[PDB]
Each structure stands twice: as C-alpha cells, then as structure tokens.
Ligand code: NA
C-alpha cells in the first residue's frame with residue numbers, strides 16, 4: 001500500500017492571496033520516499049489550487065459533483081466531523097467517478113463507555129455495502145478521534161494503531177483479505193512534525209488526514225514520514 | 231429607489247464551461263432604463279464570475295466572509311429557503327462590510343391559516359434591531375412565497391404587491407419613514423418574461439430575486455422590466 005497524506009485546510013486560509021502563497025510554498029517542497037498527496041480546500045479556493053498546485057499532487061473538495069469535476073478535480077472528503085445517508089453519498093460519488101476519503105470515528109461518550117471499537121465497526125459496516133465492486137481502489141478511510149478533538153482529552157500513538165486495525169479487521173471479515181490488504185486507512189487526529197514519524201511506523205496506519213499543520217511548512221515533514229512506514 | 235434585480239443561479243449550472251457561456255451572454259445584454267443588477271452563483275464559480283462578468287453588475291455569494299471579500303465580492307444572499315440566528319448573521323455581515331439580500335417569507339401552513347402578514351411581519355421585526363445605523367443603504371429585502379414554491383399552489387400579482395407592502399409597513403412603524411422609503415423590497419417568487427412587467431408595476435415591488443429564468447436569455451427581459459416601475 002502506498003502511504004497517503006491528505007492536507008485538510010478546513011475553513012482556511014482566510015484570503016485567496018494567502019492560499020496562493022501556501023501553494024507556492026508547497027510547490028517547492030522536496031518529497032522523499034513513496035507517497036500519494038492530496039490537498040482539500042474551501043470551495044472558493046478550489047479553482048486556484050487546481051490551476052496552480054504541483055501536478056504530482058491532487059486537489060480535493062471538502063464535501064459534496066459535476067461542478068467540481070468540470071475543473072478536473074478527482075477527490076472529495078466525505079463524513080468529516082446519519083451513516084445510511086453518508087454511505088449513500090459514498091455510493092453516489094464513486095458511481096460518478098470520484099475518489100473518496102471516507103471519515104469515521106467515535107465521540108467522547110462512546111469512548112468513555114468502552115464502546116469505541118463497537119461504534120467504529122458499525123460505521124464501517126454501514127459503509128461496506130455501498131462501495132461498488134471495482135471501486136475499492138478509489139476509497140481511502142480516515143479514522144477521526146472525535147473524542148480527542150476539542151474535548152481536553154488526547155489520543156495516544158497506540159490509540160491510532162488500535163483504531164486503524166479495528167477498521168482493517170472489519171474489512172477483512174466482511175469483504176475479504178484482498179480488499180483489506182489494499183485499502184489505505186489514515187489517522188486523522190492531531191498530526192504534527194513531532195509525532196508523525198512514530199505514528200507512520202504503526203503497522204495499520206497508512207497515512208494521515210492532517211488538520212492545522214497542513215497550513216504550515218511542517219506539512220512536508222508529515223508527507224515525508226512515509227519513510228518510517230514499512 | 232433604484233429598481234434592483236438579483237439573478238439567483240442556485241445550484242446551477244452544472245459545469246464551469248456552462249457558467250462561462252452564460253456570463254458571455256449576459257455581457258452582451260442591452261439594459262434599458264435605470265436598474266441595479268447582481269448575480270449570485272455557486273461558490274466554485276464565484277472566481278470565474280468576478281473575473282469575467284461585466285463590471286457594471288456585481289457578483290454575490292449565495293450564503294455566508296473574508297474569503298469572498300478577498301476576491302472583491304461585495305454581496306451575499308442571506309436566509310434563502312432561526313430568525314435570531316439569521317439576524318445575527320446579517321449583523322455580522324454588515325459589520326464586516328458586506329451588502330445583503332435578506333430573505334423572508336411564510337410556509338404553506340401559515341398562508342392557509344390566514345397568518346401570512348403576521349408571520350412575515352415578525353420575521354422583519356427580528357431583522358430590524360440587527361441592522362447597524364448607517365447600514366440601511368446596504369440592505370435589500372426579498373419576499374419569498376415559500377408556500378408557492380414546490381407546493382402546487384401559485385401566487386398572484388396581488389399577493390406580491392400585498393406582501394411587499396406588509397414589509398414596508400413594518401419598516402415604517404419600527405424604524406421610520408425615511409428608512410422605509412429607501413429600502414428596496416424584492417419579489418422572490420416565480421418571475422418570468424411573461425409576468426415581470428405587471429409585477430414591476432406594483433407600487434411596493436422594487437425588483438426581483440429571480441430563480442430559474444436567471445439562467446436563460448429571458449433574464450434581460452426581467453432586468454428591463456424596471457421601465458414599468460414608476
Ligand atoms: Na504504517
């Protein structure tokens with residue numbers, strides 16, 4: 001599996017002039033190793049990025065399809081924080097030729113209750129029937145520890161490895177080892193230059209859906225952590 | 231009051247190539263009379279319009295601010311279908327230098343109950359305290375007959391005149407005749423080349439927030455109906 005790093009700008013930066021300067025910085029970054037890089041940005045900045053961003057990386061929408069496809073954009077994030085509704089959108093996007101970063105993850109109450117693996121497994125079980133055969137090459141899954149984002153609680157490296165393996169286990173049990181061995185599963189908690197290398201080394205962590213560090217020079221460090229993933 | 235026509239593209243057209251062709255058609259349109267024209271489009275098309283649309287018209291976002299301001303966009307629609315939440319957003323947008331098309335209007339149940347004027351009056355009463363003094367020149371109000379959009383019921387020319395006067399009456403009663411005499415109040419029901427002239431002639435109708443006809447050559451007919459508004 002090729003390591004995968006998505007930069008999720010969220011609602012940033014606040015001006016198109018800042019977006020263009022960020023793209024200029026990214027275009028000079030020296031990537032090491034083997035890694036697939038995607039950058040998601042606010043809708044009004046997608047034309048700028050599609051025109052100006054280095055063509056060995058790909059642009060992503062933050063949510064959704066014919067409008068963004070008319071610019072040549074191939075990716076969207078889905079589910080970033082109803083599972084039936086979300087799975088339907090995954091089906092629609094794949095059927096219409098999009099590649100997707102499908103997000104899952106549990107809130108604080110389920111984590112504190114000891115139900116994290118049960119909750120996330122059920123989210124993926126609802127995703128699974130919606131993926132068309134032949135479309136699994138166009139799917140990446142991101143685990144978002146919602147319980148550790150804005151709560152005053154922090155996730156460990158072991159938490160990341162454990163929750164990514166939970167997802168791989170349920171793929172293997174429901175759709176088979178071939179699919180489970182090819183799907184990239186990302187950690188989408190707090191990822192920084194100070195922890196990306198130890199996170200990347202985890203066996204079931206295939207990359208990242210990066211938040212605030214995607215707006216900084218440190219994004220290249222996170223991209224280049226792929227060399228620590230076996 | 232200068233007649234005001236806003237073209238609300240909603241979630242249209244489906245490709246940027248179609249958006250550019252529509253802009254090319256609009257750029258050759260011959261406007262008659264005295265009218266202020268604004269065009270609102272999906273977020274991913276706003277850069278295209280801001281670059282290519284005739285500079286005697288203005289571009290609008292469909293909802294919201296620093297991101298669109300960084301392109302030079304001066305307008306947004308608000309409230310198109312909580313009033314306290316909506317009024318707060320109006321306050322925020324005006325305080326940050328935006329001009330707004332603030333939408334109101336009642337659903338089918340309130341219309342059938344005989345409560346249309348009471349419901350719309352209360353919506354405007356919640357809007358009124360949120361407008362900063364000195365900002366009323368940057369406010370336009372649109373009446374949307376939600377009860378006549380997708381319900382199998384149709385609004386009359388008299389309904390349009392009546393509901394626009396209801397809005398003007400409550401401005402006059404709460405903030406005074408000077409403000410009530412300057413604020414443009416738009417009809418935002420179904421507006422077509424076949425009814426725009428009789429609608430424009432209504433004394434309290436100052437223009438339109440146009441839906442599907444804004445995507446067609448007939449938009450210029452609606453823009454040019456200003457000559458029938460005294
Ligand atoms: Na790894």
Ligand code: NA
Pocket residue numbers: 429430431432433434435436437458459460
């Ligand atoms: Na009139």
